[PDB]
């Protein structure tokens, strides 16, 4: 089974210990971070259960996700203040535990929880608005992964979307508060070694367009399976095989957008699993 909640606290201390070799000025902060991460985990697991939503399923893999998500930000970021690191930690905490959260009652519940945790383990008055909308971290504007300015980001997206609008398919849209937060979310996903993000967007939200965009910013070939009523598994197999052979033997760097419509049978989805 799972370990302790006190072994988990201890195990991730050693995880933070290793990554705080890169910020030696906060070597004394590894334990309350490890205790906070585990607290956040224990609480998310408790507050958001499979009784509300099926995908509400937490495990120490989240912890490992968070701890590594923290390192990668440090290893490629500006030399860090304590106010930086907790916000750096808080960003990952949001992306790991709360992106999956539906609706708003539960989403606000986590905002309060995150606040409750910092106050209990890392007591500072230097924190700001910890809501995801207010902490925006990016490597689009800086060479180092750093917290960016809301005004600086919106304008950067605006100049790049027109370009993407001109260079690629011509579709005009309104760039808005939700969309900036989401652009960074896809960006982090498409940056990590294994990058798999599934977007749950109703329809016309723009989820398919943003994906094409952020992929273009990251310099990814956007492959979209050309399926139809009279498409066989063999067709999809071919679409997949090529995209695989190009990725290794041509070093292509493709982004495969699969819509729910594209999965025509059981096997199609099984192929996606094996991948």
């Amino acid at each position: 089974g799972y370990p302790s909640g006190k072994s988990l606290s201890q195990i991730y201390e050693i995880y933070y210990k290793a990554i705080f070799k890169l910020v030696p000025e906060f070597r004394s902060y590894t334990e309350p971070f490890a205790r906070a991460s585990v607290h956040l985990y224990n609480e998310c697991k408790a507050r958001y259960s499979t009784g509300l939503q099926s995908h509400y399923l937490f495990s120490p893999r989240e912890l490992t996700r968070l701890v590594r998500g923290v390192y990668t930000a440090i290893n490629t970021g500006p030399r860090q203040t304590l106010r930086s690191l907790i916000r750096l930690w808080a960003y990952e905490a949001w992306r790991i535990f709360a992106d999956r959260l539906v609706g708003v009652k539960e989403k606000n519940s986590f905002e309060q929880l995150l606040y409750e945790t910092v106050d209990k383990y890392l007591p500072n008055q230097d924190l700001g608005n910890i809501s995801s909308t207010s902490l925006l971290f990016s490597g689009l504007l800086s060479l180092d992964f750093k917290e960016v300015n809301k005004t600086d980001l919106v304008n950067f997206i605006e100049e790049r979307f027109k370009t993407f609008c001109d260079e690629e398919l011509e579709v005009p849209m309104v760039i808005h508060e939700s969309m900036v937060d989401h652009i960074l979310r896809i960006d982090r996903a498409l940056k990590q070694v294994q990058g798999h993000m599934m977007l749950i967007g109703a329809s016309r939200t723009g989820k398919t367009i943003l994906t094409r965009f952020v992929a273009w910013l990251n310099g990814l070939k956007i492959v979209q399976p050309k399926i139809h009523r009279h498409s066989n598994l063999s067709d999809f197999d071919m679409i997949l095989k090529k995209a695989i052979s190009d990725c290794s033997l041509k070093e292509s760097r493709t982004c495969l957008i699969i819509d729910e419509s594209n999965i025509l049978e059981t096997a199609f989805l099984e192929r996606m699993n094996t991948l």
């Binding site: 609706g103 309104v174 808005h176 508060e177 109703a202 329809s203 016309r204 939200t205 009523r229 009279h230």
Partner: protein
């Protein structure tokens, strides 16, 4: 609201009672919020779409109506200069025609809120029942009542967007007499920024649209073999297609 605002950024409008742009956007939100709340059942599967297309209908409809209001206002101003040149016994009644000139300001007051209803009919109503449409209309009218936009109290969607020449043309093909079936046909034709989905058990509609486009009418079905190619031929040379 962020999205609505940038879509109505273009400003045909003129001062009203109370902001004017701020009011319009707040109505549409409060209508979309009321539409899904009353009509749709099931827990939060569906979200904003009609809203975008409802705004896009309004922009296309206000532009079409304000340019036609200013066109009729120009037709009575050109007749004002021609009667003043002449001045005899009957012509001074014609000059009096400030009742119409006075009437224009009241007509322009309501055109923004009249376009609100027309756009809502085209977008939200297409698939609603006789009673389902009327009842939403009331909720829209009382929303138009809360906000300081003026609407026509004696308003009729048919007469407002259908022209008597077209209304005749439709029936000539063989559209049914009913008000419901008129509104439906108006919804299909009037707005074509989007492909229309016609649902009718009796494929009496598949002939109506065939009579209207005649030779140009090429009929297909998603089930036939040659569908894949026959559509590529239909698209290349401007053929009007029903699937």
């Amino acid at each position: 609201s962020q999205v609505a605002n940038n879509m109505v950024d273009v400003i045909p409008m003129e001062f009203t009672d109370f902001t004017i742009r701020d009011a319009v956007v707040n109505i549409l939100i409060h209508f979309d919020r009321n539409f899904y709340q009353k009509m749709k059942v099931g827990v939060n599967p569906r979200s904003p779409g009609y809203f975008i297309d409802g705004l896009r209908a309004l922009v296309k409809l206000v532009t079409a109506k304000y340019q036609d209001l200013q066109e009729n206002q120009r037709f009575v101003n050109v007749g004002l200069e021609k009667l003043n040149e002449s001045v005899k016994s009957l012509t001074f009644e014609k000059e009096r025609w400030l009742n119409t000139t006075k009437q224009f300001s009241k007509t322009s007051q309501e055109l923004i809120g009249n376009c609100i209803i027309s756009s809502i009919y085209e977008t939200y109503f297409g698939h609603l029942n006789e009673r389902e449409r009327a009842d939403m209309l009331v909720i829209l009218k009382r929303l138009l009542g809360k906000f300081a936009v003026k609407y026509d109290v004696n308003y009729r969607f048919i007469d407002y967007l259908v022209t008597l020449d077209e209304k005749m043309k439709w029936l000539e093909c063989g559209l049914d007499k009913n008000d419901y079936f008129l509104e439906n046909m108006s919804i299909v034709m009037n707005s074509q920024d989007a492909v229309p989905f016609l649902l009718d058990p009796s494929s009496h509609m598949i002939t109506v649209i065939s009579n209207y486009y005649g030779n140009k009418t090429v009929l297909l079905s998603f089930l036939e073999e040659g569908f894949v190619k026959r559509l590529e031929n239909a698209i290349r040379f401007g053929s009007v297609v029903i699937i």
